[PDB]
């Protein structure tokens, strides 16, 4: 799992993954919902 956002110098997730409020990359509501830092729409 890649890191992102505040927790990784502002980095975007690879492969259209959502960056959670904790700075981890995945595509579940826990990552793409409230607090999502980037690519919250899956990179559409």
Curated annotation (Swiss-Prot):
What region holds the Chitin-binding type-1 domain? 2-42
Task: Look up the domain of life of the source.
Answer: Eukaryota
Q: List the disulfide bonds.
A: 4-19, 13-25, 18-32, 36-40
**Any idea what job this protein has?**
Probable inactive chitinase-like protein that does not exhibit hydrolytic activity toward chitin. May bind chitin and be involved in plant defense against fungal pathogens.
The record's family statement is: Belongs to the glycosyl hydrolase 19 family. Chitinase class I subfamily.
* Protein name (Swiss-Prot/TrEMBL): Probable inactive chitinase-like protein LaCIC
Q: Which organism is it from?
A: Hevea brasiliensis
């Amino acid at each position: 799992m890649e890191q992102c956002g505040r927790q990784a110098g502002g980095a975007l997730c690879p492969g259209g993954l959502c960056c959670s409020q904790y700075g981890w990359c995945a595509n579940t509501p826990e990552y793409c919902g409230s607090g999502c830092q980037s690519q919250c729409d899956g990179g559409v």
